């Protein structure tokens, strides 16, 4: 090429400092948790309803 | 008493020995554990609060 290096480790770069970013927002954002787990029989009895 | 010592120690004794014999009893029953909870350990997204 004329400006890029390689295909795979820039876009590999690429997708760490989004996946970074993704975190930073998500963690300080309104991400509702939203869970299918509605465990009724915990507290020392773990396990998954049927 | 003119044929034994103190009516507490003795019957102390009396109930140590039958709380045995009751467990031996009880151990080769078939009670269908009855109890209070509903098996609500794993799943913990519903756990009886009542």
């Given at each position: 090429?004329?400006?890029?290096?390689?295909?795979?480790?820039?876009?590999?770069?690429?997708?760490?400092?989004?996946?970074?970013?993704?975190?930073?927002?998500?963690?300080?954002?309104?991400?509702?948790?939203?869970?299918?787990?509605?465990?009724?029989y915990?507290?020392?009895?773990?396990?998954?309803?049927?």
């Amino acid at each position: 090429n004329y400006g890029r290096g390689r295909e795979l480790m820039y876009q590999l770069e690429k997708k760490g400092k989004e996946i970074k970013r993704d975190l930073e927002k998500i963690l300080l954002s309104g991400q509702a948790r939203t869970d299918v787990l509605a465990d009724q029989y915990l507290t020392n009895s773990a396990a998954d309803p049927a």
